[PDB]
Amino acid sequence: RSTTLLALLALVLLYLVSGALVFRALEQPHEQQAQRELGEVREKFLRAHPCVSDQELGLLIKEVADALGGGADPQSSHSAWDLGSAFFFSITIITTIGYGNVALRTDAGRLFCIFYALVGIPLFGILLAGVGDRLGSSLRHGIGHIEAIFLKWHVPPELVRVLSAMLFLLIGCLLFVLTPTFVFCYMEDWSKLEAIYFVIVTLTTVGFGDYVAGADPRQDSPAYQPLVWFWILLGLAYFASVLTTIGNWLRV
Amino acid sequence: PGRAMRSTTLLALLALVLLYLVSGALVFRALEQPHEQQAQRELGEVREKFLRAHPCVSDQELGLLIKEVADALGGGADPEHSAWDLGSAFFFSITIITTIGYGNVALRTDAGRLFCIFYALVGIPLFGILLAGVGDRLGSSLRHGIGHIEAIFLKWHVPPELVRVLSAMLFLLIGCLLFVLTPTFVFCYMEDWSKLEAIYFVIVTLTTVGFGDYVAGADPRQDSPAYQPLVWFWILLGLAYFASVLTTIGN
Ligand SMILES: [K+]
Ligand SMILES: [K+]
Ligand SMILES: [K+]
Ligand SMILES: [K+]
Ligand SMILES: [K+]
Ligand SMILES: [K+]
Protein backbone atom coordinates (compact mmCIF):
# COMPACT_ATOMS: atom_id res chain seq x y z
CA ARG A 1 0.00 0.00 0.00
CA SER A 2 1.58 3.23 -1.25
CA THR A 3 -0.61 5.47 0.91
CA THR A 4 -0.63 3.57 4.21
CA LEU A 5 3.15 3.07 4.20
CA LEU A 6 4.12 6.73 3.83
CA ALA A 7 1.35 7.75 6.23
CA LEU A 8 3.07 5.78 8.99
CA LEU A 9 6.62 6.65 7.92
CA ALA A 10 5.88 10.37 8.03
CA LEU A 11 4.10 9.73 11.33
CA VAL A 12 7.27 8.03 12.58
CA LEU A 13 9.50 10.83 11.31
CA LEU A 14 7.38 13.45 13.07
CA TYR A 15 7.40 11.15 16.09
CA LEU A 16 11.20 10.94 15.93
CA VAL A 17 11.49 14.73 15.76
CA SER A 18 8.97 15.43 18.53
CA GLY A 19 10.73 12.93 20.79
CA ALA A 20 14.11 14.54 20.20
CA LEU A 21 12.81 18.05 20.84
CA VAL A 22 11.32 17.00 24.18
CA PHE A 23 14.53 15.11 24.97
CA ARG A 24 16.48 18.25 24.08
CA ALA A 25 14.36 20.34 26.45
CA LEU A 26 14.86 17.84 29.27
CA GLU A 27 18.59 17.12 28.96
CA GLN A 28 20.26 20.21 27.47
CA PRO A 29 20.06 22.42 30.58
CA HIS A 30 21.48 19.62 32.75
CA GLU A 31 24.40 19.18 30.35
CA GLN A 32 25.14 22.89 30.01
CA GLN A 33 25.15 23.18 33.79
CA ALA A 34 27.55 20.25 34.17
CA GLN A 35 29.98 21.69 31.62
CA ARG A 36 30.02 25.11 33.28
CA GLU A 37 30.49 23.25 36.57
CA LEU A 38 33.55 21.58 35.07
CA GLY A 39 34.45 25.00 33.69
CA GLU A 40 34.46 26.46 37.19
CA VAL A 41 36.52 23.73 38.88
CA ARG A 42 38.97 23.91 35.97
CA GLU A 43 39.73 27.52 36.92
CA LYS A 44 40.19 27.33 40.69
CA PHE A 45 42.58 24.37 40.49
CA LEU A 46 44.59 26.31 37.92
CA ARG A 47 44.36 29.45 40.05
CA ALA A 48 45.38 27.85 43.35
CA HIS A 49 48.09 25.80 41.66
CA PRO A 50 50.08 27.74 39.01
CA CYS A 51 52.65 24.93 38.86
CA VAL A 52 49.89 22.76 37.43
CA SER A 53 49.60 23.40 33.69
CA ASP A 54 46.27 24.10 32.00
CA GLN A 55 46.89 21.01 29.86
CA GLU A 56 48.35 18.85 32.64
CA LEU A 57 45.17 19.49 34.61
CA GLY A 58 43.11 18.41 31.61
CA LEU A 59 45.18 15.27 31.03
CA LEU A 60 44.28 14.26 34.58
CA ILE A 61 40.59 15.00 33.95
CA LYS A 62 40.79 12.62 31.01
CA GLU A 63 42.79 9.94 32.82
CA VAL A 64 40.27 10.07 35.66
CA ALA A 65 37.35 9.44 33.30
CA ASP A 66 39.01 7.76 30.31
CA ALA A 67 40.53 5.12 32.59
CA LEU A 68 37.85 4.65 35.24
CA GLY A 69 34.80 4.61 32.98
CA GLY A 70 34.02 2.08 34.03
CA GLY A 71 35.16 1.70 37.62
CA ALA A 72 34.89 4.27 40.39
CA ASP A 73 36.28 5.63 43.64
CA PRO A 74 33.62 8.00 45.04
CA GLN A 75 33.16 -2.71 43.68
CA SER A 76 35.60 -4.51 45.99
CA SER A 77 38.28 -6.21 43.86
CA HIS A 78 35.67 -7.72 41.53
CA SER A 79 36.69 -9.08 38.12
CA ALA A 80 34.95 -7.74 35.01
CA TRP A 81 35.25 -11.09 33.23
CA ASP A 82 34.56 -13.77 35.82
CA LEU A 83 32.25 -16.70 35.05
CA GLY A 84 29.26 -14.67 36.22
CA SER A 85 29.62 -11.42 34.30
CA ALA A 86 30.80 -13.31 31.22
CA PHE A 87 27.62 -15.35 31.47
CA PHE A 88 25.82 -12.03 31.86
CA PHE A 89 27.63 -10.54 28.87
CA SER A 90 26.72 -13.53 26.71
CA ILE A 91 23.04 -13.17 27.59
CA THR A 92 23.12 -9.47 26.70
CA ILE A 93 24.01 -10.57 23.16
CA ILE A 94 21.41 -13.23 22.34
CA THR A 95 18.73 -11.20 24.12
CA THR A 96 19.89 -8.21 22.05
CA ILE A 97 19.75 -6.15 25.25
CA GLY A 98 23.47 -5.43 24.98
CA TYR A 99 24.11 -3.35 28.10
CA GLY A 100 27.69 -2.66 27.05
CA ASN A 101 28.60 -1.90 30.66
CA VAL A 102 31.56 -4.23 30.22
CA ALA A 103 33.45 -3.51 26.99
CA LEU A 104 35.30 -5.95 24.74
CA ARG A 105 38.95 -5.02 24.25
CA THR A 106 40.63 -8.03 22.65
CA ASP A 107 40.18 -8.12 18.87
CA ALA A 108 40.00 -11.91 19.05
CA GLY A 109 36.98 -11.63 21.35
CA ARG A 110 35.29 -9.16 19.02
CA LEU A 111 35.39 -11.57 16.08
CA PHE A 112 34.00 -14.41 18.18
CA CYS A 113 31.34 -12.04 19.51
CA ILE A 114 30.16 -11.33 15.96
CA PHE A 115 29.65 -15.00 15.13
CA TYR A 116 28.28 -15.50 18.65
CA ALA A 117 25.61 -12.91 17.87
CA LEU A 118 24.70 -14.18 14.39
CA VAL A 119 24.03 -17.70 15.68
CA GLY A 120 22.93 -16.93 19.23
CA ILE A 121 20.09 -14.46 18.68
CA PRO A 122 18.06 -16.65 16.32
CA LEU A 123 18.73 -19.57 18.68
CA PHE A 124 17.49 -17.60 21.68
CA GLY A 125 14.76 -16.07 19.53
CA ILE A 126 13.17 -19.49 19.10
CA LEU A 127 13.54 -20.39 22.78
CA LEU A 128 12.14 -17.03 23.88
CA ALA A 129 9.17 -17.32 21.53
CA GLY A 130 9.02 -20.98 22.51
CA VAL A 131 8.77 -20.42 26.27
CA GLY A 132 6.60 -17.39 25.47
CA ASP A 133 3.20 -19.06 25.19
CA ARG A 134 4.64 -22.22 26.74
CA LEU A 135 4.70 -20.19 29.93
CA GLY A 136 1.88 -17.90 28.81
CA SER A 137 -0.72 -20.55 28.00
CA SER A 138 0.44 -22.36 31.13
CA LEU A 139 -0.48 -19.25 33.11
CA ARG A 140 -3.71 -18.63 31.21
CA HIS A 141 -4.39 -22.28 32.05
CA GLY A 142 -4.40 -21.40 35.74
CA ILE A 143 -6.80 -18.56 35.03
CA GLY A 144 -9.48 -21.15 34.24
CA HIS A 145 -9.57 -22.46 37.80
CA ILE A 146 -10.79 -19.00 38.81
CA GLU A 147 -13.29 -18.70 35.96
CA ALA A 148 -15.14 -21.79 37.20
CA ILE A 149 -16.31 -20.20 40.44
CA PHE A 150 -16.26 -16.89 38.56
CA LEU A 151 -19.34 -17.92 36.57
CA LYS A 152 -22.52 -18.20 38.64
CA TRP A 153 -24.99 -15.45 39.59
CA HIS A 154 -25.44 -12.84 36.83
CA VAL A 155 -22.04 -13.77 35.40
CA PRO A 156 -21.70 -13.59 31.59
CA PRO A 157 -19.12 -16.00 30.08
CA GLU A 158 -18.54 -13.37 27.38
CA LEU A 159 -17.32 -11.04 30.12
CA VAL A 160 -15.55 -13.89 31.92
CA ARG A 161 -13.15 -13.71 28.97
CA VAL A 162 -12.17 -10.08 29.57
CA LEU A 163 -12.28 -10.47 33.36
CA SER A 164 -9.44 -12.96 32.95
CA ALA A 165 -7.70 -11.50 29.90
CA MET A 166 -6.93 -8.16 31.53
CA LEU A 167 -6.24 -10.09 34.73
CA PHE A 168 -3.74 -12.23 32.82
CA LEU A 169 -2.15 -8.98 31.69
CA LEU A 170 -2.40 -7.67 35.25
CA ILE A 171 -0.67 -10.28 37.41
CA GLY A 172 1.82 -10.87 34.60
CA CYS A 173 2.72 -7.19 34.49
CA LEU A 174 2.64 -7.37 38.28
CA LEU A 175 4.99 -10.35 38.61
CA PHE A 176 7.37 -9.15 35.89
CA VAL A 177 7.39 -5.35 36.19
CA LEU A 178 6.15 -4.10 39.57
CA THR A 179 7.81 -6.88 41.59
CA PRO A 180 11.33 -6.54 40.14
CA THR A 181 11.20 -2.75 40.58
CA PHE A 182 10.28 -3.23 44.23
CA VAL A 183 13.21 -5.65 44.49
CA PHE A 184 15.79 -3.56 42.61
CA CYS A 185 15.06 -0.59 44.87
CA TYR A 186 15.81 -2.77 47.90
CA MET A 187 18.83 -4.54 46.40
CA GLU A 188 20.51 -1.91 44.22
CA ASP A 189 19.22 1.10 46.18
CA TRP A 190 17.73 2.69 43.06
CA SER A 191 14.87 5.18 43.31
CA LYS A 192 11.32 4.03 42.57
CA LEU A 193 11.53 5.54 39.07
CA GLU A 194 15.07 4.34 38.34
CA ALA A 195 13.92 0.76 38.88
CA ILE A 196 11.01 1.16 36.45
CA TYR A 197 13.37 2.97 34.09
CA PHE A 198 15.66 -0.06 34.22
CA VAL A 199 13.00 -2.75 33.77
CA ILE A 200 11.46 -0.90 30.83
CA VAL A 201 14.83 -0.34 29.12
CA THR A 202 15.69 -3.98 29.89
CA LEU A 203 12.48 -5.65 28.68
CA THR A 204 12.36 -3.47 25.57
CA THR A 205 15.88 -4.75 24.88
CA VAL A 206 17.04 -1.17 24.35
CA GLY A 207 19.70 -1.92 26.96
CA PHE A 208 21.15 1.54 27.59
CA GLY A 209 23.49 -0.02 30.15
CA ASP A 210 23.44 2.98 32.48
CA TYR A 211 21.61 0.84 35.04
CA VAL A 212 22.44 -2.85 35.41
CA ALA A 213 20.86 -5.18 37.98
CA GLY A 214 23.74 -7.67 37.92
CA ALA A 215 27.04 -5.81 38.23
CA ASP A 216 28.13 -7.89 41.23
CA PRO A 217 26.04 -10.11 43.56
CA ARG A 218 27.54 -8.87 46.86
CA GLN A 219 29.18 -11.72 48.76
CA ASP A 220 26.04 -13.38 50.12
CA SER A 221 23.55 -13.11 47.26
CA PRO A 222 22.50 -16.79 47.15
CA ALA A 223 21.03 -16.67 43.64
CA TYR A 224 20.32 -12.99 43.00
CA GLN A 225 22.24 -12.70 39.73
CA PRO A 226 20.95 -16.12 38.64
CA LEU A 227 17.48 -14.76 39.46
CA VAL A 228 18.29 -11.67 37.39
CA TRP A 229 18.56 -13.37 33.99
CA PHE A 230 15.82 -15.77 35.09
CA TRP A 231 13.73 -12.62 35.41
CA ILE A 232 15.08 -11.55 32.02
CA LEU A 233 14.29 -14.83 30.25
CA LEU A 234 10.77 -15.29 31.61
CA GLY A 235 10.18 -11.53 31.58
CA LEU A 236 11.07 -11.15 27.92
CA ALA A 237 9.19 -14.30 26.88
CA TYR A 238 6.06 -13.11 28.67
CA PHE A 239 6.09 -9.52 27.46
CA ALA A 240 7.02 -10.55 23.92
CA SER A 241 3.81 -12.59 23.83
CA VAL A 242 1.86 -9.64 25.25
CA LEU A 243 3.26 -7.41 22.50
CA THR A 244 2.06 -9.93 19.90
CA THR A 245 -1.27 -11.00 21.39
CA ILE A 246 -2.17 -7.31 21.38
CA GLY A 247 -0.68 -7.17 17.88
CA ASN A 248 -3.28 -9.53 16.44
CA TRP A 249 -6.04 -7.82 18.42
CA LEU A 250 -4.87 -4.54 16.90
CA ARG A 251 -5.31 -5.87 13.36
CA VAL A 252 -8.28 -3.62 12.57
CA PRO B 1 -0.14 -22.32 12.29
CA GLY B 2 1.59 -22.55 15.69
CA ARG B 3 3.39 -25.65 16.94
CA ALA B 4 3.13 -26.38 20.67
CA MET B 5 5.89 -28.96 20.21
CA ARG B 6 7.58 -27.84 23.45
CA SER B 7 6.49 -30.89 25.54
CA THR B 8 9.95 -32.26 24.77
CA THR B 9 11.47 -30.02 22.07
CA LEU B 10 11.68 -27.02 24.40
CA LEU B 11 13.95 -28.72 26.93
CA ALA B 12 16.14 -29.87 24.04
CA LEU B 13 16.52 -26.24 22.98
CA LEU B 14 16.60 -24.64 26.43
CA ALA B 15 19.40 -26.91 27.65
CA LEU B 16 21.19 -26.26 24.36
CA VAL B 17 20.93 -22.51 24.93
CA LEU B 18 22.17 -22.92 28.51
CA LEU B 19 25.20 -24.89 27.33
CA TYR B 20 25.62 -22.35 24.53
CA LEU B 21 25.61 -19.40 26.93
CA VAL B 22 28.10 -21.24 29.14
CA SER B 23 30.40 -22.15 26.24
CA GLY B 24 30.14 -18.57 25.02
CA ALA B 25 31.02 -17.26 28.48
CA LEU B 26 34.00 -19.54 29.11
CA VAL B 27 35.44 -18.56 25.73
CA PHE B 28 34.69 -14.91 26.49
CA ARG B 29 36.43 -15.40 29.84
CA ALA B 30 39.76 -16.51 28.38
CA LEU B 31 39.62 -13.81 25.70
CA GLU B 32 39.15 -10.86 28.06
CA GLN B 33 40.48 -11.91 31.48
CA PRO B 34 44.12 -11.29 30.50
CA HIS B 35 43.27 -7.73 29.42
CA GLU B 36 40.63 -7.36 32.15
CA GLN B 37 39.18 -4.15 33.57
CA GLN B 38 40.80 -0.73 33.90
CA ALA B 39 39.03 -0.16 37.22
CA GLN B 40 40.55 1.17 40.45
CA ARG B 41 44.28 0.73 39.78
CA GLU B 42 44.36 3.46 37.14
CA LEU B 43 42.87 6.33 39.10
CA GLY B 44 45.11 5.39 42.01
CA GLU B 45 48.31 5.42 39.97
CA VAL B 46 47.44 8.53 37.96
CA ARG B 47 46.77 10.11 41.36
CA GLU B 48 50.34 9.46 42.48
CA LYS B 49 51.48 10.42 38.98
CA PHE B 50 50.13 13.87 39.82
CA LEU B 51 51.55 14.13 43.35
CA ARG B 52 55.08 13.42 42.13
CA ALA B 53 54.91 15.77 39.15
CA HIS B 54 53.30 18.58 41.16
CA PRO B 55 54.50 19.35 44.72
CA CYS B 56 52.21 22.35 45.30
CA VAL B 57 49.06 20.21 45.35
CA SER B 58 48.23 18.46 48.63
CA ASP B 59 46.56 15.04 48.66
CA GLN B 60 43.45 16.58 50.23
CA GLU B 61 43.17 19.14 47.43
CA LEU B 62 43.59 16.58 44.64
CA GLY B 63 41.07 14.28 46.32
CA LEU B 64 38.42 16.99 46.19
CA LEU B 65 39.32 17.65 42.56
CA ILE B 66 38.44 14.08 41.61
CA LYS B 67 35.08 14.27 43.38
CA GLU B 68 34.48 17.71 41.86
CA VAL B 69 35.08 16.35 38.36
CA ALA B 70 33.29 13.06 39.08
CA ASP B 71 30.21 15.09 39.98
CA ALA B 72 30.82 17.01 36.75
CA LEU B 73 31.19 13.87 34.63
CA GLY B 74 28.03 12.61 36.31
CA GLY B 75 26.15 15.43 34.61
CA GLY B 76 27.61 15.39 31.11
CA ALA B 77 31.19 16.64 31.23
CA ASP B 78 33.44 16.11 28.20
CA PRO B 79 37.25 15.95 28.61
CA GLU B 80 39.17 17.84 25.92
CA HIS B 81 30.41 19.71 20.77
CA SER B 82 27.13 19.36 22.66
CA ALA B 83 25.82 15.91 23.60
CA TRP B 84 22.15 16.86 23.23
CA ASP B 85 22.04 18.99 20.09
CA LEU B 86 19.27 18.45 17.52
CA GLY B 87 21.38 15.78 15.80
CA SER B 88 22.37 13.57 18.73
CA ALA B 89 18.96 14.02 20.35
CA PHE B 90 17.45 12.73 17.12
CA PHE B 91 20.09 10.00 17.20
CA PHE B 92 19.14 9.16 20.79
CA SER B 93 15.47 8.89 19.82
CA ILE B 94 16.27 6.39 17.06
CA THR B 95 18.30 4.22 19.44
CA ILE B 96 15.08 3.80 21.43
CA ILE B 97 12.56 2.75 18.77
CA THR B 98 15.13 0.61 16.94
CA THR B 99 15.96 -1.03 20.28
CA ILE B 100 19.65 -0.59 19.47
CA GLY B 101 20.21 1.75 22.41
CA TYR B 102 23.92 2.56 22.36
CA GLY B 103 23.70 4.43 25.66
CA ASN B 104 26.74 6.47 24.66
CA VAL B 105 24.74 9.52 25.70
CA ALA B 106 22.91 8.74 28.95
CA LEU B 107 19.75 10.20 30.46
CA ARG B 108 20.35 12.13 33.68
CA THR B 109 17.14 14.11 34.19
CA ASP B 110 14.50 12.27 36.21
CA ALA B 111 11.86 13.94 34.05
CA GLY B 112 13.61 12.71 30.91
CA ARG B 113 13.74 9.13 32.16
CA LEU B 114 9.97 9.03 32.68
CA PHE B 115 9.25 10.47 29.24
CA CYS B 116 11.70 7.96 27.75
CA ILE B 117 9.71 5.07 29.23
CA PHE B 118 6.50 6.04 27.45
CA TYR B 119 8.54 6.98 24.39
CA ALA B 120 9.84 3.40 24.30
CA LEU B 121 6.52 1.72 25.11
CA VAL B 122 4.92 3.54 22.17
CA GLY B 123 7.84 4.21 19.84
CA ILE B 124 9.08 0.65 19.41
CA PRO B 125 5.75 -0.81 18.29
CA LEU B 126 5.36 2.19 15.97
CA PHE B 127 8.73 1.54 14.35
CA GLY B 128 7.91 -2.16 14.52
CA ILE B 129 4.89 -1.74 12.26
CA LEU B 130 6.78 0.55 9.88
CA LEU B 131 9.62 -1.96 9.57
CA ALA B 132 7.09 -4.54 8.43
CA GLY B 133 5.92 -2.00 5.86
CA VAL B 134 9.37 -2.01 4.31
CA GLY B 135 9.09 -5.79 4.18
CA ASP B 136 5.67 -6.05 2.56
CA ARG B 137 6.55 -3.48 -0.09
CA LEU B 138 9.83 -5.33 -0.52
CA GLY B 139 7.70 -8.42 -1.02
CA SER B 140 6.62 -6.95 -4.34
CA SER B 141 10.30 -6.63 -5.18
CA LEU B 142 10.51 -10.35 -4.39
CA ARG B 143 7.48 -11.29 -6.45
CA HIS B 144 9.17 -9.44 -9.30
CA GLY B 145 12.26 -11.44 -8.38
CA ILE B 146 10.74 -14.91 -8.75
CA GLY B 147 10.45 -14.24 -12.47
CA HIS B 148 14.22 -13.83 -12.59
CA ILE B 149 15.00 -17.05 -10.73
CA GLU B 150 13.24 -19.31 -13.23
CA ALA B 151 14.96 -17.88 -16.30
CA ILE B 152 18.72 -18.14 -16.87
CA PHE B 153 19.54 -19.53 -13.42
CA LEU B 154 18.62 -23.18 -14.04
CA LYS B 155 19.86 -23.42 -17.63
CA TRP B 156 23.25 -24.77 -16.52
CA HIS B 157 23.75 -27.93 -14.46
CA VAL B 158 21.60 -26.26 -11.79
CA PRO B 159 18.29 -27.71 -10.49
CA PRO B 160 15.15 -25.48 -10.51
CA GLU B 161 14.23 -26.41 -6.93
CA LEU B 162 17.66 -25.58 -5.52
CA VAL B 163 17.54 -22.49 -7.75
CA ARG B 164 15.10 -21.16 -5.15
CA VAL B 165 17.87 -21.70 -2.60
CA LEU B 166 20.60 -20.41 -4.94
CA SER B 167 18.96 -17.44 -6.67
CA ALA B 168 17.90 -16.04 -3.30
CA MET B 169 21.58 -16.29 -2.39
CA LEU B 170 22.27 -13.47 -4.84
CA PHE B 171 19.44 -11.38 -3.40
CA LEU B 172 20.96 -12.05 0.01
CA LEU B 173 24.50 -11.31 -1.14
CA ILE B 174 23.90 -7.99 -2.92
CA GLY B 175 22.09 -6.76 0.18
CA CYS B 176 24.80 -8.22 2.40
CA LEU B 177 27.17 -6.20 0.22
CA LEU B 178 25.17 -2.97 0.18
CA PHE B 179 24.40 -2.91 3.91
CA VAL B 180 27.29 -4.78 5.54
CA LEU B 181 30.44 -4.69 3.39
CA THR B 182 29.79 -1.18 2.04
CA PRO B 183 29.35 0.60 5.40
CA THR B 184 32.42 -1.11 6.87
CA PHE B 185 34.68 0.24 4.13
CA VAL B 186 33.13 3.66 4.72
CA PHE B 187 33.38 3.61 8.52
CA CYS B 188 37.05 2.63 8.30
CA TYR B 189 37.70 5.73 6.21
CA MET B 190 35.33 8.04 8.08
CA GLU B 191 35.65 6.94 11.71
CA ASP B 192 39.21 5.64 11.20
CA TRP B 193 38.25 2.29 12.72
CA SER B 194 40.20 -0.87 11.85
CA LYS B 195 38.85 -3.28 9.23
CA LEU B 196 37.49 -5.54 11.98
CA GLU B 197 36.11 -2.80 14.24
CA ALA B 198 33.79 -1.53 11.51
CA ILE B 199 32.36 -5.03 11.09
CA TYR B 200 32.06 -5.23 14.87
CA PHE B 201 30.01 -2.03 14.75
CA VAL B 202 27.78 -2.98 11.80
CA ILE B 203 26.88 -6.43 13.13
CA VAL B 204 26.16 -5.15 16.64
CA THR B 205 24.19 -2.22 15.19
CA LEU B 206 21.97 -4.24 12.84
CA THR B 207 21.35 -6.97 15.43
CA THR B 208 20.09 -4.17 17.70
CA VAL B 209 22.47 -5.32 20.44
CA GLY B 210 23.96 -1.82 20.51
CA PHE B 211 26.91 -2.13 22.88
CA GLY B 212 27.71 1.54 22.27
CA ASP B 213 31.47 0.97 22.40
CA TYR B 214 31.52 2.19 18.80
CA VAL B 215 29.29 4.91 17.35
CA ALA B 216 29.38 6.04 13.72
CA GLY B 217 27.52 9.24 14.59
CA ALA B 218 29.18 10.87 17.59
CA ASP B 219 29.70 14.10 15.65
CA PRO B 220 29.77 14.61 11.85
CA ARG B 221 32.80 16.93 11.60
CA GLN B 222 31.89 20.40 10.35
CA ASP B 223 31.77 19.79 6.60
CA SER B 224 30.01 16.42 6.48
CA PRO B 225 27.07 17.11 4.12
CA ALA B 226 24.60 14.45 5.24
CA TYR B 227 26.83 11.87 6.91
CA GLN B 228 24.79 11.55 10.11
CA PRO B 229 21.55 11.66 8.09
CA LEU B 230 23.14 8.92 5.99
CA VAL B 231 23.81 7.02 9.22
CA TRP B 232 20.21 6.57 10.37
CA PHE B 233 19.31 6.00 6.72
CA TRP B 234 21.85 3.18 6.78
CA ILE B 235 20.10 1.89 9.90
CA LEU B 236 16.49 2.53 8.88
CA LEU B 237 17.07 0.93 5.47
CA GLY B 238 19.52 -1.60 6.88
CA LEU B 239 17.09 -2.83 9.52
CA ALA B 240 14.38 -2.86 6.85
CA TYR B 241 16.30 -5.06 4.42
CA PHE B 242 17.17 -7.81 6.89
CA ALA B 243 13.62 -7.58 8.24
CA SER B 244 12.33 -8.54 4.80
CA VAL B 245 14.95 -11.22 4.07
CA LEU B 246 14.37 -12.92 7.42
CA THR B 247 10.60 -12.91 6.81
CA THR B 248 11.04 -13.98 3.18
CA ILE B 249 13.09 -16.95 4.33
CA GLY B 250 10.09 -17.66 6.56
CA ASN B 251 8.70 -20.18 4.08
K1 LIG C 1 14.20 -7.54 18.52
K1 LIG D 1 22.01 -1.73 23.92
K1 LIG E 1 17.18 -5.11 20.73
K1 LIG F 1 28.97 8.16 31.37
K1 LIG G 1 20.03 -3.11 22.57
K1 LIG H 1 24.27 -0.30 25.36
From Swiss-Prot, chain A:
Disease tied to this entry: Facial dysmorphism, hypertrichosis, epilepsy, intellectual and developmental delay, and gingival overgrowth syndrome: An autosomal dominant syndrome characterized by delayed motor and intellectual development, poor speech, seizures, generalized hypertrichosis and facial dysmorphic features, including hypotonic facies, bitemporal narrowing, micrognathia, deep-set eyes, bushy eyebrows and long eyelashes, low-set ears, short deep philtrum, gingival overgrowth, prominent upper and lower vermilion, and everted upper lip.
Extracellular topology ranges: 24-80, 103-110, 188-192, 213-226
Species: Homo sapiens (Human)
Binding site for K(+) 3: G98, Y99, G207, F208
Chain positions carrying an annotated carbohydrate: Q75
UniProt effect for mutating T96C: Loss of voltage-dependent channel gating. Displays linear current-voltage relationship
GO BP terms in the entry: cellular response to acidic pH; cellular response to alkaline pH; cellular response to arachidonate; cellular response to fatty acid; cellular response to mechanical stimulus; cellular response to temperature stimulus; detection of mechanical stimulus involved in sensory perception of touch; memory
Chain intervals for the UniProt region annotation (Selectivity filter 1): 96-101
Post-translational events: N-glycosylated.
Functional summary from the UniProt entry: K(+) channel that conducts voltage-dependent outward rectifying currents upon membrane depolarization. Voltage sensing is coupled to K(+) electrochemical gradient in an 'ion flux gating' mode where outward but not inward ion flow opens the gate. Converts to voltage-independent 'leak' conductance mode upon stimulation by various stimuli including mechanical membrane stretch, basic pH, heat and lipids. Homo- and heterodimerizes to form functional channels with distinct regulatory and gating properties.
Chief site of localization: membrane
Residues of the full protein shown: 2 to 259 of 393
Domain of life: Eukaryota
Cytoplasmic-side positions: 1-2, 144-165
Free-text note regarding domains: Each subunit contributes two pore-forming domains 1 and 2 which assemble to form a single pore with M2 and M4 transmembrane helices lining the central cavity and M1 and M3 facing the lipid bilayer. The transmembrane helices are bridged by the selectivity filters 1 and 2 carrying a signature sequence TxTTxGYGD that coordinate the permeant ions. Up to four ions can simultaneously occupy the selectivity filter and at least two elementary charges must translocate across the filter to convert it into the open conformation.
Membrane-spanning intervals of the chain: 3-23, 111-143, 166-187, 227-252
Variant or mutagenesis effect after changing W229S: Increases basal level of channel activity and decreases further activation by pressure, but has little effect on further activation by arachidonic acid
Name of the protein in its database record: Potassium channel subfamily K member 4
Residue positions binding K(+) 1: T96, I97, T205, V206
GO cellular component, one term: node of Ranvier
Binding residue positions for K(+) 4: T96, T205
Protein keywords: Cell membrane, Cell projection, Disease variant, Disulfide bond, Epilepsy, Glycoprotein, Intellectual disability, Ion channel, Ion transport, Membrane, Metal-binding, Potassium, Potassium channel, Potassium transport, Transmembrane, Transmembrane helix, Transport, Voltage-gated channel
Residues binding K(+) 2, per UniProt: I97, G98, V206, G207
Any GO molecular function: potassium channel activity
Membrane association type: Multi-pass membrane protein
Coiled-coil annotated spans: none
